Amino acid sequence: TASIAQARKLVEQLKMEANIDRIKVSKAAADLMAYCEAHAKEDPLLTPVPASENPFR
Amino acid sequence: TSFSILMSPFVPSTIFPVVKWITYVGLGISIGSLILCLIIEALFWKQIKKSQTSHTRRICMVNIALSLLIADVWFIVGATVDTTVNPSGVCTAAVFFTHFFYLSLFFWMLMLGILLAYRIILVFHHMAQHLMMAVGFCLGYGCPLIISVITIAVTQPSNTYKRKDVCWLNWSNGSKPLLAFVVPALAIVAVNFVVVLLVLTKLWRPATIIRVGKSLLILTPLLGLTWGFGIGTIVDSQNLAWHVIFALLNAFQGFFILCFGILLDSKLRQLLFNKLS
Amino acid sequence: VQLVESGGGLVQPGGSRKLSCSASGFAFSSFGMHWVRQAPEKGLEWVAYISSGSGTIYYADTVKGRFTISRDDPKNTLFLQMTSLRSEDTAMYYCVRSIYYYGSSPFDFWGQGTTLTVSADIVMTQATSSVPVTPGESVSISCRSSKSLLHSNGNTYLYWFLQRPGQSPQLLIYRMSNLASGVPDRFSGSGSGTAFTLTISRLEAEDVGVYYCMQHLEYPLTFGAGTKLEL
Amino acid sequence: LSAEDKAAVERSKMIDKCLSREKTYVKRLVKILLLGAGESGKSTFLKQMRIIHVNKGIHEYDFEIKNVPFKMVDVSERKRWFECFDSVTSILFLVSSSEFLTESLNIFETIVNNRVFSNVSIILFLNKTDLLEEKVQIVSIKDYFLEFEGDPHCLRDVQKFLVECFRNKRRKPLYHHFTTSINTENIRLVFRDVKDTILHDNLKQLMLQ
Amino acid sequence: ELDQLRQEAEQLKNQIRDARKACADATLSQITNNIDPVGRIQMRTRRTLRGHLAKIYAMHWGTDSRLLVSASQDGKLIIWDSYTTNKVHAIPLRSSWVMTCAYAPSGNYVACGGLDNICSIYNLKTREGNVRVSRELAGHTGYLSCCRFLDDNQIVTSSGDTTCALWDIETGQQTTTFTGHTGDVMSLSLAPDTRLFVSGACDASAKLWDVREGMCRQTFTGHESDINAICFFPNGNAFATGSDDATCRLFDLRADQELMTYSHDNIICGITSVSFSKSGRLLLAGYDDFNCNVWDALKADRAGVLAGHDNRVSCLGVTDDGMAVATGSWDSFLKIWN
């Protein structure tokens, strides 16, 4: 009864999640490095800025 | 120069050739142990700051060590400087300084005893950290300053703060400035004694003997119970052997502080051995 | 929010008076408070400042020491005690609310204030005492300063207030750039160190009146003559 | 500073004062979890203390036993969130000695062995002891399979077995009591346990033990 | 019929496992064997924000990268000026057992919540000048782990009742309820576009939810214990988790599988917080060994160590300009690093 309904919900959710579009890990790696290289100069913790501009130095 | 000269008005001439050397050896070991203790405290200060009660205790420890270092150096100075050639300057500055810093030692030990009593009896009582700092520094250094300055102001113009032979302080059928050290110090010792018993009152309620003995021997040097032997060196001249006991248990007080109040704590031992490797 | 001031009136030469402000509808203990004067036909002028916690107190150098400031937080009542009142003190006084934390809006509320009649510091020139305008046309107003207000912390501390005819001033511009709450977004302004032009796009009615400019860079706070937009 | 910083700074200082004024109170406050594995017994016991005192999620109860601020917290799986209670002085664990107790014992074992609770003492209240006495006197199945102390006793051997079962899942002290049906005194008997707890904590902090 | 549905669920799980195995053409580490390591990044304590009276459990930065809301177990919620170490506000909470905080993107609001099962939203900019409770949001059966604002009138909560909620603050009613977790939800993070979010929930499983639709859009697994921290790479197409199994992991939504594990053999304590640097080059993770570390995200090596905390680091956060990073630990101290 109730267990049947819970199992139906679980099966429907698994079906909905299974059919989603998937891409290779290489594209994920490429996009992560693309973001990291695109904004390297604007990452002050990664690249420390001069104290004359730093709001904490 | 005997250590008992702090408490004792007199030192027997027969035992003096041994008592003076006991005092020199003990004072060397004491100054060395105090230097080592304060170096350890400064180096490991940031690694031991865990609780407010332990914080106040470590403050009292550091101040006791500082007071005994200063006063031990000053006592050796007063022992090495002749009175006839230097009626002033040294040997009167030395006297006031050594008196003040011994009162600092004894009043910091009293502060440690009061802290123990306050943390054992008034368990549900808390008071501002800076206000405890205020009381501790006002009693441990304010009271010694007040007492020693009053003594010098009531003695020096009449030339009694000086001694005759060894540059410490006088008591001879007249002006008695020595009772500005013997009276307070031993009084404090009495108080500390009560405190020690109270702690035993709490450690005998339930390795009971081992723990009780460890507590007793970690509290006797830091609360200065050994200074109670001074009573004897005022009560009688020698009798059996009071001056020898005084020198053997009180001159090395810095050594005992280092060995027990520093080198018997498990955490400090672990940190020091890890650093030394 | 409501600051209701009381105590005004006429005094004989010399004498004394105690003005008060009742604060209702805000956390008066958290707000610093100012007393700001205004001569009957002249510009504004600053009188005194009491801080949150009844600590910092600043006085106008003109009548300093002859008056004092105080606050009563439980009663939410502010006080200014004037002593030895000469004719130069004849002005309408206003009690002003200002809170100081990052991003706050100092001088955000003004009472109606009360009249009080009797029978180096930085200077700003209000270059014009009047600008004729036609409603619906954009207007722009000039104040000149005698020192840079761009402090090293990145701020600039000039303020623009508006007294509409018969009212108490309302903050238009706080800190040389910003816009207060309750004023239309058509008000703005810009400037550089020692110069500023206030901009009103789409001048509407009720914008007639006098615009005032003040320095909260250091003390005292100095006021200009105020430009009277006429219509 | 541009003085609008100065006022700003002053504001911060005021806030600091307030926080300092609360530090001393936070130390003065004693926290006690209430873990009882049931609903009726906890309600009755809290009702008794509330009668003594008067004369949502967590149900914080605030009271005083001898002019000491006391907060009793009284909050499946309890693993990550159940770690904010490592700041409490005690854990009052109410179980009834007239209803058998494997689940109560297992919950006790999970509680006590947690590193969250190493600096937290535990006060084992065994209540409904009148019910236990009646259950033993009147012919009823008595605790068995390790109770080598005689089932048909009056009151003592069964109690000793219960406690010596409760003190055995420990690899701060573990107090215990045998309060009666409701009780006559309950606040002065938790006050003693918390005072001994804090005294031992103070003694440890003074390297004096 | 129950057995048939269980078999169908097992078949679907096998299909999902095979699909995720398919796209794993190469491990993320292999494509990173040619990137210049960032080396040792030594960050000092520019500011120490002291004043909390007890354990700090959560912290949040402002969008101006200067204001900061921190939140501790003593019942206080303090707003600091990071630049000047000034306490802008001190908000006393009605329930001390509180384990989250948030700072509205517009800066007009902050949020908090905890063991009272309530998400309290406070108005910072009121005419009356005090920070008052704008709304108490109620409806969660369990304790509240984390709350984030999408905007000034929509908030998102996660609770230890296997449930997240999207609330309309004006009405006060759950506009959407997200269900599907098995265990207690511990942390959620919102994407930069504020249309999606991710959640970790004590069942070693993470879920990407759609705010508008309300359905569990994606799921991820791989961890071994409670997931205590979660955040997005600063583009909303990656997210990193920390767990009590002493292992951080970087997942990607589109690849729909695990990409890296940040771990060390000397790391045996769990992970309390994670937050990315602005460029995504640094993942700063808080731990229970009293320390906070800094991983070069793209190389899985340890770029730095933010030692300085005497107790467990419970929260950390990198600004919106990436200038500083704030760490709050159970030592009642908050520290700004740059």
Residue numbers in the entry:
A (entry chain D): 6 to 62
B (entry chain R): 567 to 772, 784 to 854
C (entry chain C): 2 to 120, 138 to 249
D (entry chain A): 12 to 66, 205 to 224, 229 to 253, 266 to 336, 341 to 378
E (entry chain B): 3 to 340
Could you pull the original sentences from the published paper?
GPR110, also known as ADGRF1, is an aGPCR that plays a key role in neurite growth and synaptogenesis in the cortical neurons. A general activation mechanism of aGPCR involves the removal of the GAIN domain through an autoproteolysis process which generates a short peptide called stalk peptide right before the transmembrane domain, then the stalk peptide inserts into the ligand binding pocket of the receptor and activates receptor in model called “self-activation by tethered agonist”. In this work, we report cryo-EM structures of GPR110 in complex with Gq, Gs, Gi, G12 and G13 and systematically compare all major G-protein couplings in one receptor which revealed undisclosed information of G-protein coupling. The global structures of the GPR110/G-protein complexes resemble most of class A GPCR/G-protein complex, in which the G protein use the αH5 of Gα to engage the intracellular cavity of receptor.
For G12 and G13 complex assembling, we swapped the “GGSGG” linker of mini-G1219 or the alpha-helical domain (AHD) of G13 with the AHD of Gi, a strategy that has been successfully used in the assembling the type 1 bradykinin receptor (B1R)/Gq complex. In addition, we substituted the N-terminus of G12 and G13 with the first 18 residues of Gi to render their abilities to bind scFv16, a fab fragment that has been successfully used in stabilizing receptor/G-protein complex. The global resolutions for the Gq, Gs, Gi, G12 and G13 complex are 2.85 Å, 2.84 Å, 3.09 Å, 2.8 Å and 2.66 Å respectively based on the gold standard of Fourier Shell Correlation (FSC) = 0.143 criterion. We then looked at the GPR110/G13 engagement. The overall engagement is similar to G12, both of them use extensive hydrophobic interactions to engage the receptor. For instance, in the G13 engagement, L368G.H5.16, L372G.H5.20, L377G.H5.25 line up to a stretch of leucine (brown arrow) to engage the hydrophobic groove formed by L7695.61, V7655.57, L796 6.45 and I7956.44, whereas in G12, those three leucine residues spark at different direction. Also the last residue of Gα13, Q378G.H5.26, are in close contact with R7886.37. In addition, Q374G.H5.22 forms a hydrogen bond with T6192.45. Together, those differences enable G13 to engage receptor tighter, which explains why the GPR110/G13 complex has a better density map and a higher resolution than the GPR110/G12 complex. A comparison of the overall αH5 engagements shows that distances between αH5 and the TM3/TM5 groove are G13 < G12 < Gs, < Gq < Gi., with αH5 of G13 closet to the TM3/TM5 groove and Gi farthest to the TM3/TM5 groove.
